[PDB]
Amino acid sequence: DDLIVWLRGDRAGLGPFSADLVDQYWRWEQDPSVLIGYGRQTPDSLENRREGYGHQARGTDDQLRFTVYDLTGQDPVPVGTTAVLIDHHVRTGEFVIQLGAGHRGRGLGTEATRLTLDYAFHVSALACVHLAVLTPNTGAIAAYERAGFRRIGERRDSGFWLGRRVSETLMDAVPEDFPGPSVVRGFVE
Amino acid sequence: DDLIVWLRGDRAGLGPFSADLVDQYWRWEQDPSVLIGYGRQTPDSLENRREGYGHQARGTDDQLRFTVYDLTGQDPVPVGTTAVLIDHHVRTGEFVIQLGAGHRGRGLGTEATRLTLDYAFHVSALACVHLAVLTPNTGAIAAYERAGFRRIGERRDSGFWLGRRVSETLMDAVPEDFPGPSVVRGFVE
Amino acid sequence: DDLIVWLRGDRAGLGPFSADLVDQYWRWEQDPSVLIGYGRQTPDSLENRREGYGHQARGTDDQLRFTVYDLTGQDPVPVGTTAVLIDHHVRTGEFVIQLGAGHRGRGLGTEATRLTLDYAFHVSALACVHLAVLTPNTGAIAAYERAGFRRIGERRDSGFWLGRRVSETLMDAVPEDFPGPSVVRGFVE
Amino acid sequence: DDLIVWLRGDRAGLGPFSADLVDQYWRWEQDPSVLIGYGRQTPDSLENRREGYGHQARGTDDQLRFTVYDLTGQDPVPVGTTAVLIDHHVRTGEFVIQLGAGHRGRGLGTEATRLTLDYAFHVSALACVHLAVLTPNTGAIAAYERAGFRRIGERRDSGFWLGRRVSETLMDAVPEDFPGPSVVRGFVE
Amino acid sequence: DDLIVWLRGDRAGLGPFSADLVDQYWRWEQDPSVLIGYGRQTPDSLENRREGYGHQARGTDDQLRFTVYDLTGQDPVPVGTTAVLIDHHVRTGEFVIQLGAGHRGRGLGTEATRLTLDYAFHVSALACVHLAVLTPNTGAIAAYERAGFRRIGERRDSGFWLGRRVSETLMDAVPEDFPGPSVVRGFVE
Amino acid sequence: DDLIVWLRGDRAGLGPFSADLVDQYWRWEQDPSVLIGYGRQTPDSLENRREGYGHQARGTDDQLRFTVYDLTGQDPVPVGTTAVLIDHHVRTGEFVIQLGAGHRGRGLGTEATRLTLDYAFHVSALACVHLAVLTPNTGAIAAYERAGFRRIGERRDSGFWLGRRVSETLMDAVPEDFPGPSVVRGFVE
Amino acid sequence: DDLIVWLRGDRAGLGPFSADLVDQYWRWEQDPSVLIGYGRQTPDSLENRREGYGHQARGTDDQLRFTVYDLTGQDPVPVGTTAVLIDHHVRTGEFVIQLGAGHRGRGLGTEATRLTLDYAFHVSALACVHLAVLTPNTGAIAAYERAGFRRIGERRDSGFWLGRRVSETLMDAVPEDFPGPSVVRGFVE
Amino acid sequence: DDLIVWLRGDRAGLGPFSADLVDQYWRWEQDPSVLIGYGRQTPDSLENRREGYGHQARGTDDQLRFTVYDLTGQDPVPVGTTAVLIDHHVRTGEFVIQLGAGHRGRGLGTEATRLTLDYAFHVSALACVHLAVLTPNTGAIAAYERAGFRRIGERRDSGFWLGRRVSETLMDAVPEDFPGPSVVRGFVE
Ligand SMILES: CC(=O)SCCNC(=O)CCNC(=O)[C@H](O)C(C)(C)COP(=O)(O)OP(=O)(O)OC[C@H]1O[C@@H](n2cnc3c(N)ncnc32)[C@H](O)[C@@H]1OP(=O)(O)O
Ligand SMILES: CC(=O)SCCNC(=O)CCNC(=O)[C@H](O)C(C)(C)COP(=O)(O)OP(=O)(O)OC[C@H]1O[C@@H](n2cnc3c(N)ncnc32)[C@H](O)[C@@H]1OP(=O)(O)O
Ligand SMILES: CC(=O)SCCNC(=O)CCNC(=O)[C@H](O)C(C)(C)COP(=O)(O)OP(=O)(O)OC[C@H]1O[C@@H](n2cnc3c(N)ncnc32)[C@H](O)[C@@H]1OP(=O)(O)O
Ligand SMILES: CC(=O)SCCNC(=O)CCNC(=O)[C@H](O)C(C)(C)COP(=O)(O)OP(=O)(O)OC[C@H]1O[C@@H](n2cnc3c(N)ncnc32)[C@H](O)[C@@H]1OP(=O)(O)O
Ligand SMILES: CC(=O)SCCNC(=O)CCNC(=O)[C@H](O)C(C)(C)COP(=O)(O)OP(=O)(O)OC[C@H]1O[C@@H](n2cnc3c(N)ncnc32)[C@H](O)[C@@H]1OP(=O)(O)O
Ligand SMILES: CC(=O)SCCNC(=O)CCNC(=O)[C@H](O)C(C)(C)COP(=O)(O)OP(=O)(O)OC[C@H]1O[C@@H](n2cnc3c(N)ncnc32)[C@H](O)[C@@H]1OP(=O)(O)O
Ligand SMILES: CC(=O)SCCNC(=O)CCNC(=O)[C@H](O)C(C)(C)COP(=O)(O)OP(=O)(O)OC[C@H]1O[C@@H](n2cnc3c(N)ncnc32)[C@H](O)[C@@H]1OP(=O)(O)O
Ligand SMILES: CC(=O)SCCNC(=O)CCNC(=O)[C@H](O)C(C)(C)COP(=O)(O)OP(=O)(O)OC[C@H]1O[C@@H](n2cnc3c(N)ncnc32)[C@H](O)[C@@H]1OP(=O)(O)O
């Protein structure tokens, strides 16, 4: 009962960024695959994440932070995190996502991204959500395309993939391109 | 016995803004339906609400904060919160209200608003209580009209409803329009 | 040359909220006619205004503050102040205005309000600008109507006019109702 | 002699971000045309810019700030500012530029951007410089293309131009696409 | 389960710099053989190491710190520490390593250094990793050569070995010289 | 008379790091040629150098800082700076040097480096002075070789020269290789 | 197992300056015989020693502090303390030693001093260790001579022995005079 | 008249450590010959000496600091500094002295040392004054011997002279060996 779920899809759900899961967040974020995908170069320390959680909690006015839940089992189980950094001046947000090691390839990222778009469009009233993703990270590309993002173009020589200088793909999503039924509309009506 | 009730109506009651219910207040306020109705765009964090409760408690000179109780059962059960921000210079207040997910449609909002008007008129000696409500939120409109509010007009393009730009309805209530018997008069006489 | 002018109309102009004019701002704001029109009940002290100017200058992210200039003479002469309090979450702002004692009835308020609407619509990208004005203040009503505001309705018994309890008129303006040519479009094109 | 010039082109030059010009920087940055082009919605206050200059000066490890000079006259005259925010983890920077009101259309922006690219590529050893520009700002588009930037694509509905929701163009530049002779190579050899 | 392992080789592995092992780190670092090899002249105090651990944890942006694990047994057992001090301006790092007294000569240092090179090249995207080692410390020389380092030369009279003034050997490693299969590539692909 | 000179050679001299020359030090250090030679990527701000001078002055226990003087004229004129960072544990120091734009190629760097070696060997009693220099910086190589440094080797891919990844040359000097007469011996005997 | 031993001789050993033994250190140091031998005139208080231990632990860069162990029994038992105050500028240290009341005359001081010399010469790379000892303290003289110290001379009238003004003997030791096998060489080879 | 003189000999005198001469003290102390003689390895900064003067002035309970005066001219002229660090527990002090560059070889050091001994013996009531001097510094040896010091012995390999490891000579002086008439006795009788 402690694990609150706000948005419930068919396969995934979103809930708040609970403080009981800060060590799990640290372990997910310091996985080498996530470091490669994000492009972070150094692991962070657990003490520093524990300290940073308080500042993350205080600064919530222009930031969405969710814990994604796998709803295929009897009870929800957290599988990753999603975040949108909101710029209230232009109604846009920047989207990032990562899942745990054992939860990838099962589709949870696609519906997690779709639910994040639903929340950002229909609760936050954002006009555009955009992301930057390293070009070789093709799985994320496909997940974002099916979630509702569209390709803008490639920013040449702007990241490292396994030490090699590679481009990164810029993608964006707009409310009129949002696929599938919206859970938030079900909440309101 | 810990749950203090000040005003007791037929279906609802009002009591103080107890500190034992801060987590319940957070869970009510972060529900997506309440976020849509209020027009808030980002969830707040539990730590930030816990911190803010102390400041809310200290600043009570020009602020009413109540917990609404359902009195239909054997014991009172809290179902929502009501607040009036008081401007002592002109004897007016701004009214907001929200209930929990499972308590809507049973009428508790109407008598909660009516009791809030009774307290604001007959204890706080306010000359006018007003509110701003998004136009598509028709249930709140009907509840406010039966509680004692009257429509002023529509403020065009001043809010978002499911990402769509919509108007909001301005309403106000005056003591000479207060319907039904007053509990506070029963307290005094 | 010290008096910077950003927007130049036919009769009026807008510039920044200069620190050399804080005493003039205090004298304008403490005039009994402005106190009656705004509904403020006590004069403020010059020391307190001098202290507050620094905090006003620091907090500029969601606030417009202009000094209105009379451009009918050889050089600009400041005649009043205009302000818009911006709510970035919904792209709306609340508008207030006052002129000095000897500058009223010459039309400067109308073009000052119109230029403020031009700036708020075409630079700040606001969807709605609204105001609250005491009903007996009919001159302000006419000035706002010709500037581009439209009447919403009356909030009953929500202010004092010469000690008498009176209503206040709510007005709003939208970009599609903005009259006349826009100076900002001339800046851009 | 006080105006230091580091890079000297045919028409323009770059020098340090001198503290004697903070008021001129404020006046340039608060011009309505620059506010429209950048997409900033509120003017900043002179006191706040004066305070911020110290923090800008202290934080120079990952930030380039230049004052652009017009070298067509007998002595250099500052005409604008250029900045690159450096991300040392991936050797990339984000580029912004603005000129004063009377210096546009004379070409100074093109060589200012080209010299900024020369410095960023050949002194800072950056692999990619990128920018975000509102689509209707076509003059900046042409200036950036001739300076050495190439178009990536359009980020849909991510900015306001005169209150209208418009897209913004993403551009980037790489060392192998840098046009013309490099001044920095002349410094070294 | 508390002992996290990120990189797993055949004989060794790398994990985070856990706080539960600060006393073990102190005992390893104060061993006379490690003091001779590093060239440190005075033992450090346990209280000072306990204090320093917090500062080491906070400063992780340009520093790699690993605990090396022996994976030959049923469960991982920590045997030493490796560190890379990163200079993000030029994509280079300085490498140091020490093992516990009973774990030397079994090969763990070679694969620990190789895995550190793998992480530094393929996650941190470093172009060069270099080290300084006292010339008489021939075992470390052989371990570094087989791990992937190459000899640069000798810095004359720049260290003490058992009180005698001796030279130190400078070595470096580049990605194109990295031997053997990379674990990180297995993580990504 | 204010310009103190400690060591006087035939062409050059060394004196203390006077506070009257902090702006001249800033202008020398921010020259693009010095930034290329040192490998620094961003200019520093004058305010930050002025602040840092106090901390540089306080920390003199393990640091040599000199201003080099040209003694060919009637009076000494400062032409550059030299520094040695001392590690008292092993009696070694790291050497850096830069001259002003108009003073290079006249030989002053060679005798400045030689006098710095004389001071470091015969006053500081250092056993080894070493340096790191980018390989394409051949003039510095020749100056250091004639001053008394000897080549160790090349550290591959450890710096940028005009944006290109290049190696850097490691050099060292020992007292028994110190060429020419020593001024310090003249001071003592 | 808590009692760490670094250097192990035939009769004695040296380990770190453990915090569990601060009261034992106080009791040893306040013994009247140690006060006479050192020449201290007043006892120190236990609270002051407990406070000072933290500062002693923090300042370890130029200070050796050991606890001497008697290794004749089954387990090590601490019998005294040895200290060397290091001057890193000239590679010299000043040596002091005291044992507990019941451990003198059994030889432990001689090997404790010899092991301290071994550590100071072969780990700290000191060129000279010296001491000052009151002339009537003949037992310490003999112990120091057999440990490896040689007599310099007598500093006349520079101490008190039982209230009488007496001279103190100055002694020093150099690596080339170090007697017996070195444990540290066994650690390294 | 500002230059106070306490002790007046035939050729030299001693006075207080005036604050008007802090820059002259810095210039004397940073002369390379004084650095060689004392054995200091790095010059100190003028700001640091100016800061340290206040702390030197406050701590005068166990410290003598004099400015030596040349009394051969019409008025006293300061030529150096002398200091005695007093250990009140045993009535002993450690003596140091340096003169300016142009005042050596004229005998002023001998009478300055003799007057310092007179003050230390007959005002401070010290039983022994001692010094440590590098062995090659033979002029200081002769000056100290004629002033009243006697040789104790040589501390082997405890200093550097022009980079060479040399011994230092230990000397001491006692009241019964004080040569010549005492000025202080003339003050008292
Ligand atoms: C915003 C940024 O900066 S990008 C950073 C992204 N974060 C990371 O990469 C960290 C590690 N990766 C992850 O956490 C996750 O993989 C995410 C969040 C990127 C989402 O990836 P997934 O959850 O696996 O996508 P998902 O599981 O919904 O399925 C995506 C589709 O991509 C396709 N796909 C998967 N892998 C590959 C591949 N290697 N190549 C091509 N296509 C692939 C599959 O068809 C898959 O459909 P299916 O798995 O449902 O059958
Ligand atoms: C002040 C502001 O800014 S408005 C913010 C209001 N807060 C929220 O909307 C948060 C979510 N909603 C709520 O918490 C509650 O619904 C409140 C506080 C608005 C009150 O709503 P309710 O308590 O359901 O009104 P209530 O239950 O007293 O009945 C209201 C009447 O509205 C009518 N009504 C209910 N839903 C609808 C609807 N979708 N359409 C039209 N009419 C409706 C019904 O006839 C109902 O009568 P009944 O339910 O007693 O039979
Ligand atoms: C936002 C709020 O809370 S309302 C607070 C308003 N502030 C104040 O009232 C302070 C004192 N008043 C003022 O500073 C100014 O009068 C303002 C800012 C309200 C603007 O008023 P004005 O500048 O005089 O309006 P303006 O001069 O542009 O002309 C307005 C028109 O109103 C009409 N008008 C003026 N007075 C009256 C009146 N007493 N009755 C009816 N109509 C009138 C006139 O036709 C006039 O047209 P004209 O003067 O150009 O010929
Ligand atoms: C990075 C960002 O976020 S974009 C923010 C850009 N900043 C601003 O827009 C603030 C206001 N504008 C400016 O300060 C300047 O115009 C800059 C910095 C954008 C550069 O613009 P300019 O300096 O005028 O470009 P420049 O003068 O070098 O010439 C650019 C070319 O664009 C072309 N051009 C100019 N105006 C237009 C126009 N309205 N439509 C189409 N093309 C145009 C011309 O052919 C011109 O060539 P020319 O003027 O040398 O004959
Ligand atoms: C970066 C610096 O500043 S150097 C500081 C290094 N740190 C230290 O020296 C502290 C003490 N030493 C250690 O901790 C470890 O010995 C390390 C980290 C240096 C690595 O040494 P090792 O782990 O023993 O190397 P490793 O075990 O992988 O084998 C190295 C090879 O060197 C060779 N080798 C070992 N000892 C010697 C020796 N005395 N002489 C010559 N060759 C030797 C062996 O052939 C060995 O192969 P093998 O042991 O697998 O059969
Ligand atoms: C320690 C480090 O990190 S290296 C950083 C060095 N700093 C810099 O490079 C900043 C800019 N450069 C300088 O300040 C100076 O050039 C220094 C300090 C490097 C010294 O260079 P110089 O003072 O010119 O050397 P110097 O003048 O004594 O003469 C050096 C010799 O190099 C030779 N030389 C000069 N230029 C070149 C060249 N481009 N190619 C080959 N050889 C050259 C000449 O024969 C010259 O002899 P000469 O000039 O007396 O006839
Ligand atoms: C550094 C300074 O300032 S000196 C301060 C020294 N500290 C103290 O004196 C405090 C009290 N004393 C002590 O703690 C210890 O006695 C120490 C540390 C000085 C060492 O003294 P010891 O450990 O007894 O010397 P040790 O036991 O190794 O033997 C020394 C030799 O001196 C000789 N000796 C002992 N006592 C005397 C004596 N009274 N007269 C002459 N010779 C003596 C013996 O032959 C002895 O050989 P042996 O005891 O092995 O048979
Ligand atoms: C306490 C310490 O740590 S020692 C540090 C001493 N400080 C310094 O050395 C700094 C530089 N030197 C000085 O400041 C001064 O020389 C001092 C303070 C050491 C005193 O030296 P002086 O004042 O020259 O001694 P003084 O002038 O009184 O005469 C000393 C005698 O030494 C003899 N002497 C002088 N130089 C030499 C020499 N190179 N070799 C042998 N004998 C010499 C002379 O016979 C001289 O007699 P005279 O000069 O009166 O005819």
Nearest ligand 4 atom to the CA of D113 is: 18
Phi, psi of H25 (to 5 degrees): -60, -45
Phi, psi of F99 (to 5 degrees): -115, 165
Distances (CA, A) of E47 to A46, E32, E52, G57, G85: 21, 19, 9, 7, 20
Contact B93, B87 (CB under 8 A): yes
The CB density around residue D2, as the number of other CB atoms within 10 Å, is 5
Estimate the share of chain F in helix, then strand, then coil, as percent rounded to the nearest 5. Answer: 35, 35, 30
Partners of H174 on chain G (C-beta within 8 Å) are 156-157
Determine if residue D24 is left, alpha or beta; phi over 0 gives left, psi from -120 to 50 gives alpha, anything else beta.
Answer: alpha
* DSSP β-bridge partners for residue H67: H15, H81
The CB density around residue D27, as the number of other CB atoms within 10 Å, is 17
F49-54: long-range contacts, CB 8 A cutoff, minimum separation 24: F49/F22, F49/F25, F50/F22, F50/F26, F51/D58, F53/F19, F53/F22, F54/H47
Distances (CA, A) of C167 to B121, B131, C154: 17, 15, 6
Collapsing DSSP to helix, strand or coil, C71 comes out as coil
Dihedral (C-alpha) G151, G153, G158, G159: value to the nearest 10 degrees?
Answer: 30
Contact E120, E93 (CB under 8 A): yes
- Ligand 1 lined by A96 (C-beta under 6 Å): yes
| β-strand pairing of C128-134 with C92-99 | parallel
Which DSSP category does E42 fall into? S
Strand order in the sheet with G63-70: G7-8, G12-15, G63-70, G77-87, G92-99, G128-134, G164-173, G150-161
Partners of F64 on chain H (C-beta within 8 Å) are 42-43
What's the N-to-C CA distance of chain C in angstroms? 26
* DSSP β-bridge partners for residue B159: B166
Residue A11 is labelled as binding a ligand: yes
Closest C-alpha to E87, from E127, E133, E38: E127
Report how far residue E46's alpha carbon sits from residue E29's, in angstroms, rounded to the nearest whole number.
Answer: 11
Report how far residue E19's alpha carbon sits from residue A45's, in angstroms, rounded to the nearest whole number.
Answer: 10
The sign of the CA dihedral C116, C118, C122, C126 is positive
Report how far residue A35's alpha carbon sits from residue A47's, in angstroms, rounded to the nearest whole number.
Answer: 18
Q: What is the number of helices (H) and of strands (E) in chain F? A: 6, 8
Q: Report how far ligand 4's centroid is from the alpha carbon of D96 (Å).
A: 13
Q: Which helix (H) or strand (E) holds D36?
A: helix D32-38
Nearest ligand 2 atom to the CA of B97 is: 18
Residue F58 CB contacts under 8 Å (≥ 6 apart), including other chains = H45, H47, H48, H51
Collapsing DSSP to helix, strand or coil, B60 comes out as coil
Which DSSP category does F137 fall into? -
Q: Give A135 to chain B, closest Cα distance, Å.
A: 31
Report how far residue A173's alpha carbon sits from residue E183's, in angstroms, rounded to the nearest whole number.
Answer: 35
The CB density around residue A138, as the number of other CB atoms within 10 Å, is 11
Distances (CA, A) of H149 to G141, H91, H94, H156: 25, 17, 12, 20
Report how far residue E120's alpha carbon sits from residue E122's, in angstroms, rounded to the nearest whole number.
Answer: 6
Structure tokens at B178: 């207060």
Q: Which helix (H) or strand (E) holds A12?
A: strand A12-15
* DSSP β-bridge partners for residue E164: E161
Collapsing DSSP to helix, strand or coil, B119 comes out as helix
Closest C-alpha to H79, from H2, H146, H187, H3: H3
Residue G187 forms contact with E (CB below 8 Å): yes
> Given an 8 Å threshold on Cβ–Cβ distance, is C16 in contact with D43?
yes
Burial of B54 (0-12, 13-18, 19+ CB in 10 A): exposed
CA E126 from chain centre, in angstroms, equals 16
Dihedral (C-alpha) E34, E35, E36, E40: value to the nearest 10 degrees?
Answer: 140
Q: Give B41 to chain A, closest Cα distance, Å.
A: 4
Calculate ∠ Cα D139-D141-D145, nearest 5°: 120
Collapsing DSSP to helix, strand or coil, H64 comes out as strand
Cβ contact E–G (≥3 pairs, < 8 Å): yes
Report how far residue D152's alpha carbon sits from residue D131's, in angstroms, rounded to the nearest whole number.
Answer: 10
Report how far residue D140's alpha carbon sits from residue B77's, in angstroms, rounded to the nearest whole number.
Answer: 63
Report how far residue A66's alpha carbon sits from residue A119's, in angstroms, rounded to the nearest whole number.
Answer: 11
Phi, psi of F18 (to 5 degrees): -65, 145
The sign of the CA dihedral A72, A77, A80, A85 is positive
| β-strand pairing of C7-8 with C12-15 | antiparallel
Report how far residue F2's alpha carbon sits from residue F72's, in angstroms, rounded to the nearest whole number.
Answer: 18
* DSSP β-bridge partners for residue B77: B70
Ligand nearest the Cα of residue F104 is 6
Which DSSP category does B45 fall into? P
Concatenated DSSP letters of chain G:
--S--SEE-SSEEEE---GGGHHHHHHHHTSHHHHHHHT--SPPPHHHHHHHHHHHHH--TTEEEEEEEE-SSSS-EEEEEEEEEEETTTTEEEEEEEE-GGGTTSSHHHHHHHHHHHHHHHTS--SEEEEEEETT-HHHHHHHHHHT-EEEEEEEEEEEETTEEEEEEEEEE-GGG--S--HHHHHH-
Report how far residue G176's alpha carbon sits from residue H7's, in angstroms, rounded to the nearest whole number.
Answer: 48
Contact F128, F91 (CB under 8 A): yes
Structure tokens at D20: 């004697």
Report how far residue E12's alpha carbon sits from residue E116's, in angstroms, rounded to the nearest whole number.
Answer: 11
Structure tokens at B150: 């009257």
Residue H31 CB contacts under 8 Å (≥ 6 apart), including other chains = F6, H100, H101
Closest C-alpha to H112, from H20, H1, H6: H6
Calculate ∠ Cα D131-D135-D141, nearest 5°: 60
Report how far residue F62's alpha carbon sits from residue F85's, in angstroms, rounded to the nearest whole number.
Answer: 6
Residue E37 is labelled as binding a ligand: no
> Given an 8 Å threshold on Cβ–Cβ distance, is G89 in contact with F89?
no
Structure tokens at E95: 């490498």
The CB density around residue H70, as the number of other CB atoms within 10 Å, is 22
* Residue at H22: amino acid letter: V
Report how far residue B98's alpha carbon sits from residue B112's, in angstroms, rounded to the nearest whole number.
Answer: 10
Half-sphere exposure at residue E7, Cβ-oriented, CA atoms within 13 angstroms: 30
Residue H94 forms contact with G (CB below 8 Å): no
Report how far residue E173's alpha carbon sits from residue E118's, in angstroms, rounded to the nearest whole number.
Answer: 11
Length reported for chain D:
189
Closest C-alpha to D117, from D64, D51, D56, D62: D64
Report how far residue C67's alpha carbon sits from residue C69's, in angstroms, rounded to the nearest whole number.
Answer: 6
* DSSP β-bridge partners for residue F129: F93, F173
Report how far residue F125's alpha carbon sits from residue H162's, in angstroms, rounded to the nearest whole number.
Answer: 7
Burial of A64 (0-12, 13-18, 19+ CB in 10 A): buried
Burial of C54 (0-12, 13-18, 19+ CB in 10 A): middle
Report how far residue F153's alpha carbon sits from residue H24's, in angstroms, rounded to the nearest whole number.
Answer: 46
Report how far residue A18's alpha carbon sits from residue A76's, in angstroms, rounded to the nearest whole number.
Answer: 14
Report how far residue C107's alpha carbon sits from residue C111's, in angstroms, rounded to the nearest whole number.
Answer: 7
Place of tokens 């020369």: D118
Structure tokens at G86: 């290091």
Phi, psi of G151 (to 5 degrees): -75, 135
- Ligand 6 lined by F33 (C-beta under 6 Å): yes
Report how far residue H135's alpha carbon sits from residue H165's, in angstroms, rounded to the nearest whole number.
Answer: 11
Residue D47 forms contact with C (CB below 8 Å): yes
Collapsing DSSP to helix, strand or coil, H123 comes out as coil
Structure tokens at C163: 């000690």
CA-based nearest residue in chain H for residue F187: H33
* Residue at H139: amino acid letter: G
Structural determination approach = cryo-EM
Q: In chain E, at which residue ranges do the beta strands (DSSP E only) sit?
A: 7-8, 12-15, 63-70, 77-87, 92-99, 128-134, 150-161, 164-173
Which site among C63, C87, C91 would you substitute to test the A interface, given the most A Cβ atoms closer than 10 Å to its Cβ?
C91
Structure tokens at F175: 């007292």
The CB density around residue H13, as the number of other CB atoms within 10 Å, is 26
Calculate ∠ Cα B84-B89-B92, nearest 5°: 35
CA F103 from chain centre, in angstroms, equals 14
Closest C-alpha to B67, from B100, B106, B33: B100
Ligand nearest the Cα of residue G9 is 7
Contact H48, H100 (CB under 8 A): no
Structure tokens at E148: 């992937």
Q: Report how far ligand 3's centroid is from the alpha carbon of C143 (Å).
A: 5
Distances (CA, A) of H23 to A97, B69, H19, H134: 63, 81, 9, 27
Report how far residue F36's alpha carbon sits from residue F41's, in angstroms, rounded to the nearest whole number.
Answer: 8
Residue nearest to atom 18 of ligand 1 (CA): A98
Q: Give E5 to chain F, closest Cα distance, Å.
A: 30
Dihedral (C-alpha) D97, D102, D108, D112: value to the nearest 10 degrees?
Answer: -30
Residue H154 forms contact with G (CB below 8 Å): yes
Which site among H26, H30, H45, H158 would you substitute to test the F interface, given the most F Cβ atoms closer than 10 Å to its Cβ?
H45
- Ligand 4 lined by D136 (C-beta under 6 Å): no
Q: What is the number of helices (H) and of strands (E) in chain H? A: 6, 8
Contact C7, C118 (CB under 8 A): yes
CA-based nearest residue in chain B for residue A175: B163
Closest C-alpha to A73, from A12, A133, A16: A12
Structure tokens at C49: 């205004």
- Ligand 2 lined by B85 (C-beta under 6 Å): no
* DSSP β-bridge partners for residue F94: F85, F130
Radius of gyration of chain G from Cα atoms? 16
